[PDB]
Scaffold this active site. Structure first.
Site, PDB file in Angstrom:
ATOM      1  N   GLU A   1       1.593  -7.825  -3.681  1.00  0.00           N
ATOM      2  CA  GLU A   1       0.338  -7.873  -2.882  1.00  0.00           C
ATOM      3  C   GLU A   1       0.708  -7.997  -1.408  1.00  0.00           C
ATOM      4  O   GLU A   1       0.051  -7.353  -0.571  1.00  0.00           O
ATOM      5  CB  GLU A   1      -0.521  -9.008  -3.312  1.00  0.00           C
ATOM      6  CG  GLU A   1      -1.197  -8.836  -4.647  1.00  0.00           C
ATOM      7  CD  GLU A   1      -2.243  -7.776  -4.687  1.00  0.00           C
ATOM      8  OE1 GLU A   1      -2.576  -7.215  -3.589  1.00  0.00           O
ATOM      9  OE2 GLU A   1      -2.697  -7.372  -5.762  1.00  0.00           O
TER      10      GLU A   1
ATOM     11  N   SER B   1     -14.793  -4.581   3.333  1.00  0.00           N
ATOM     12  CA  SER B   1     -14.116  -5.893   3.024  1.00  0.00           C
ATOM     13  C   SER B   1     -12.652  -5.859   3.473  1.00  0.00           C
ATOM     14  O   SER B   1     -12.122  -4.806   3.640  1.00  0.00           O
ATOM     15  CB  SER B   1     -14.214  -6.242   1.537  1.00  0.00           C
ATOM     16  OG  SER B   1     -13.325  -5.441   0.747  1.00  0.00           O
TER      17      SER B   1
ATOM     18  N   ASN C   1     -10.081 -11.266  -1.380  1.00  0.00           N
ATOM     19  CA  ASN C   1     -10.994 -10.285  -0.839  1.00  0.00           C
ATOM     20  C   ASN C   1     -12.243 -10.929  -0.267  1.00  0.00           C
ATOM     21  O   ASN C   1     -12.759 -11.948  -0.766  1.00  0.00           O
ATOM     22  CB  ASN C   1     -11.344  -9.253  -1.946  1.00  0.00           C
ATOM     23  CG  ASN C   1     -12.205  -8.078  -1.462  1.00  0.00           C
ATOM     24  OD1 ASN C   1     -13.481  -8.152  -1.607  1.00  0.00           O
ATOM     25  ND2 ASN C   1     -11.616  -7.006  -0.933  1.00  0.00           N
TER      26      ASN C   1
ATOM     27  N   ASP D   1      -8.730  -7.797   2.648  1.00  0.00           N
ATOM     28  CA  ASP D   1      -7.956  -8.697   1.795  1.00  0.00           C
ATOM     29  C   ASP D   1      -6.935  -9.419   2.598  1.00  0.00           C
ATOM     30  O   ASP D   1      -6.240  -8.828   3.440  1.00  0.00           O
ATOM     31  CB  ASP D   1      -7.171  -7.967   0.725  1.00  0.00           C
ATOM     32  CG  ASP D   1      -8.027  -7.197  -0.181  1.00  0.00           C
ATOM     33  OD1 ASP D   1      -9.099  -7.678  -0.507  1.00  0.00           O
ATOM     34  OD2 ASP D   1      -7.594  -6.145  -0.633  1.00  0.00           O
TER      35      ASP D   1
ATOM     36  N   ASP E   1     -14.607  -0.081   1.529  1.00  0.00           N
ATOM     37  CA  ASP E   1     -15.962  -0.648   1.488  1.00  0.00           C
ATOM     38  C   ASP E   1     -16.260  -1.546   2.720  1.00  0.00           C
ATOM     39  O   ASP E   1     -17.348  -2.139   2.809  1.00  0.00           O
ATOM     40  CB  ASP E   1     -16.214  -1.352   0.149  1.00  0.00           C
ATOM     41  CG  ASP E   1     -15.275  -2.480  -0.109  1.00  0.00           C
ATOM     42  OD1 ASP E   1     -14.459  -2.747   0.823  1.00  0.00           O
ATOM     43  OD2 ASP E   1     -15.326  -3.057  -1.210  1.00  0.00           O
TER      44      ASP E   1
ATOM     45  N   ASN F   1     -10.210  -2.490   3.404  1.00  0.00           N
ATOM     46  CA  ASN F   1     -10.659  -1.595   2.317  1.00  0.00           C
ATOM     47  C   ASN F   1     -11.750  -0.683   2.780  1.00  0.00           C
ATOM     48  O   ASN F   1     -12.384  -0.890   3.749  1.00  0.00           O
ATOM     49  CB  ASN F   1     -11.115  -2.352   1.163  1.00  0.00           C
ATOM     50  CG  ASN F   1     -10.033  -3.138   0.639  1.00  0.00           C
ATOM     51  OD1 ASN F   1     -10.098  -4.341   0.661  1.00  0.00           O
ATOM     52  ND2 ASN F   1      -8.965  -2.462   0.243  1.00  0.00           N
TER      53      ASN F   1
END
Ligand code: NA
EC number: 3.2.1.17
Length: 129
Positions: free
Chosen positions: A35, A50, A59, A52, A48, A46
């Site tokens: 990750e 959002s 998220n 992380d 959308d 991301n």
């Protein structure tokens, strides 16, 4: 902070992750590697909108407040900046919520694609634990 592999394992063990919801400690180390590269300050945006954050790429749509994610929840009741600190406490306590949610460690796509089904105890081999 960029952790060493065994240093993170130890830290993860100290925060109660080894066998949390039945996931052996190597699963958590493996997820961290892929990750974030063990880098607490990792952020990724991301499609959308959002973002992380942190060692476990938590998220913004569901788990932390970053002020720029519409209509999002904050189910860990933290600013997403809490997840970039050298102290892993907020990341670990939020990840305990996430893994509890119903899909286990499948929530972390890189766990599912790169750690699930593999010899994850290799991640802890050699460490003084
Ligand atoms: Na949010």
């Amino acid at each position: 902070k960029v952790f060493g592999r065994c240093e993170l394992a130890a830290a993860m063990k100290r925060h109660g992750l080894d066998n949390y919801r039945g996931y052996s400690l190597g699963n958590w180390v493996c997820a961290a590697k892929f990750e974030s590269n063990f880098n607490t300050q990792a952020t990724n945006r991301n499609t959308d909108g959002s973002t992380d954050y942190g060692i476990l790429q938590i998220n913004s749509r569901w788990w932390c407040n970053d002020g720029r994610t519409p209509g999002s929840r904050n189910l860990c009741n933290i600013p997403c900046s809490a997840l970039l600190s050298s102290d892993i406490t907020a990341s670990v306590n939020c990840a305990k919520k996430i893994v509890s949610d119903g899909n286990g460690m499948n929530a972390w796509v890189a766990w599912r694609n790169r750690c699930k089904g593999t010899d994850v105890q290799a991640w802890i081999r050699g460490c003084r634990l």
